[PDB]
Amino acid sequence: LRDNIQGITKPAIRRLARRGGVKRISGLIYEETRGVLKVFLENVIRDAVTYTEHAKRKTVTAMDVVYALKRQGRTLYGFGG
Amino acid sequence: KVLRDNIQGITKPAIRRLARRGGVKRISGLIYEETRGVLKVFLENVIRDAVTYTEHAKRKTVTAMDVVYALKRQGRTLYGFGG
Amino acid sequence: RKESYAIYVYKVLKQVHPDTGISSKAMSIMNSFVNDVFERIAGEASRLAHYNKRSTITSREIQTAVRLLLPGELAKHAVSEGTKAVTKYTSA
Amino acid sequence: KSRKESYAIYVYKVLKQVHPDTGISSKAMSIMNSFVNDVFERIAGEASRLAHYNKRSTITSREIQTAVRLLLPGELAKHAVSEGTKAVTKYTSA
């Protein structure tokens, strides 16, 4: 498990900008977006996993992610949370 | 007809001073009426919540605690008056 | 055993749109919505009661909570259904 | 009339261990009070949710700890956890 941040491929970032209403994208946007996503995921997984452990579990649950998102003000509906 | 509507009491010189504190160097004329609008909306949101706290406690006086609590709800936590 | 508001959501769905269904993922979101508003109102009520050194949450705290949490028109109608329900409940 | 509790005397005592010759104005003391009530609520509140998620009736130092880990920024958390663990250990050994 090494360099998966590149799984977020140029095409996929483009589709996301599109849904976002973006018509033209500069070449340096793709590395910037990966950076942004990495921090976002780091913060959510950090909190989610803290919930896992407090409950002495080895399996991260949907609820763990949902409580982590609510802590960060990004309430998500649909998975129990 | 007198000399001032209340929101016009927030004056150019004062608005300028605020901006200065915010590091603004040059200000366009239209900014002044624009700022008053934003201030009005901000106070309506806070005073309304605070007053709802006043009525709930069957009082006729808005207390610092009523503002401090409204501010906290609106995510604008203020330290200094209970908090 | 795990409860959800699914059947009540479904009854209500049938009153407003007698011939419309709902996919499970959508019911799931509806269950989320109801639990969300519930915690938001109760919590608002909880603080309300505390600030006033009261140890009881009544229809009255729930009402202020509703006023502080919901936007304009939605509150107007929520408060109505709420007052209405308590009055009707109290006569039996 | 009545009583109005505040953390002031405790805040003052701590100010001395840190800056024995430094003082603090009234308004500033109010901010510190606000600050202490604020962190308290945040930590307790979080501890409260942790217990509920895990279907527990009790808030133990364990919950206070995880809350701290969730609310405080890194280094702050590191030390905060340290002090907390020390206080309980000492309290017990007595």
Next chain:
Amino acid sequence: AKAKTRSSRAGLQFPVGRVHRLLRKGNYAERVGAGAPVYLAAVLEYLTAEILELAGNAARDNKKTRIIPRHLQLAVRNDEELNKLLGRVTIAQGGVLPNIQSVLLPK
């Protein structure tokens, strides 16, 4: 005799007993008066009715009979108040409202 549920006594579809129970178990106060759950069940029932009323319309407008997440998203985002009540909420599989800034259109 006859034993009528507290919900029917209030004229509600939502469960008054359940809500009352949930109120006590969630530790919100020492005591929970009888009106609290009735009133809360009612506000909760009114809110789900308003959103289903609107989602059901988005379904119909897209020629569908079953409400899916996108229908809940459209109803919420197109409603000024529900949009704010849920201003910091993400509806999974909801997409976004179609919207293209003007300077990006041709001619």
Next chain:
Amino acid sequence: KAKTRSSRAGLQFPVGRVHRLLRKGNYAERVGAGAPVYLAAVLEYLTAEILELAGNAARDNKKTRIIPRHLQLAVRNDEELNKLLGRVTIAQGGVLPNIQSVLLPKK
């Protein structure tokens, strides 16, 4: 012989008080014996951290009494405290000195 829990934990903060405040706060049905010790230790530590930095700020201004401005300068010049108090306003604190470089006179 009655000794205070604060002395046993070896803390300046009121352990008996924090306990009382946890119970009344309706945070849970029960409150363990060590939780108030722990929570008071954390409260004390953070309190020292801010006064420690504000004190310094007082010294830098050739002043011996800490005022709001000194607490504001302490918090915003510290990455971590600034984050912890990211959505908090310190009354009478002012802001940090800062002018965007492009607004400076061309030397």
Next chain:
Amino acid sequence: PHRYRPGTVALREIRRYQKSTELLIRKLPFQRLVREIAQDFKTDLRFQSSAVMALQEASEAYLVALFEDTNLCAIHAKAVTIMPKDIQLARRIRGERA
């Protein structure tokens, strides 16, 4: 006649106001506005001196930060003058408009 070039006096004011902490809106006018806005939510109200003070403190801090973000949007536009457009764009991204 001695005259300072445009910007030299403003720059002096930014230095001055970033050093102080006093409120910048005149109190009475502020108090009148506050009470007026209040009057639409409930008649015949009274305000503790400290409640008005808290509101001004909160309002000023709020405006001073909005001005910071506005400068940034203006500079983004490659200007050095804040305009309605810039306050508008900042409130929008802050989620205050959306």
Next chain:
Amino acid sequence: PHRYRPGTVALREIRRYQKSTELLIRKLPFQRLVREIAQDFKTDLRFQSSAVMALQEASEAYLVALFEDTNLCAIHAKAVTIMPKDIQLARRIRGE
């Protein structure tokens, strides 16, 4: 051999993607990223498939909203192309 002008297909895509709701990042790639980040936090962790899905649903909704603000920031610069300076201003004003 027929050729659409630059931008015509981009507008076609915006209308297409703003109309549907499927996730846009490939699933497997996204999951490895989750496991990689989580792992560098704590080893021997396991994931419920719905947990990875919830993280993905949140992540994509977060980036899409970010691109709207970015897009607004670029246009504010009298451009029609988003650049890093725009993403950065949107995050700086958001409080990120």
Next chain:
DNA sequence: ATCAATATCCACCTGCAGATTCTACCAAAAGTGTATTTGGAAACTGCTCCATCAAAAGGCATGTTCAGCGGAATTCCGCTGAACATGCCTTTTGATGGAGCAGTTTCCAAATACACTTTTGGTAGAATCTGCAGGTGGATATTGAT
């Protein structure tokens, strides 16, 4: 404005996964029905502190002038959108073994529940102390004109 190459709208249509539909079990819910405890509304009142009014106080509104900046126009180089060829890795369909979560039961360390004794933090009023904010002075850096 006419025309060719594409994309798009769209109603008809069949396979299938996901939704509605019982049958039966049920313990956890919810409700009915005395008995016991009490929270806080309500009435009365005392003491703040808030609204108001006078006057000593110190900003703000107003018009003139001009320098500098918003934004329109022009220009060019390079970079980003289309279109296309090639092939790989995601995705989809399955089955498998096991780790790890979650149900059930036994039991004790820790927590609640008074009841009693001691102590301590908040309050009120009185008196004495002191850190620093402006106010002066004279030196010097800053700015803008020549």
Next chain:
DNA sequence: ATCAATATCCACCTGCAGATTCTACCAAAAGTGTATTTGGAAACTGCTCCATCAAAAGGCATGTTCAGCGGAATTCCGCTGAACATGCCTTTTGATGGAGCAGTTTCCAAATACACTTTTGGTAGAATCTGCAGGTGGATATTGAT
């Protein structure tokens, strides 16, 4: 570069608003000893679902060419905001009745607590059903060259 007008500093000064030390009375804490109750861990283990290996194929990622067009650098004109001195109308400050925030006291409607009795929302496993996804095709735009 040369003054000349001002702004900014710094070292020193002193009065007073706000910080402090002090005694006392005391209800509310907070600590202590005893009795009873229980939340939740250790232990055993049923059972869901997570990781994983397998294989086939096409959706979709990657790498390239080519040229249209846009970021951004530069020049520029009038328009508009910064500076400034000019004149007073509004804010600020210190002083005074009374309106309400509270402290206290009472007493009942309403909320626990506990024992049964009764209705019911989940759900384990079914079999039957229906909306729509996705394929097809042909009528209708929408685009871009000329």
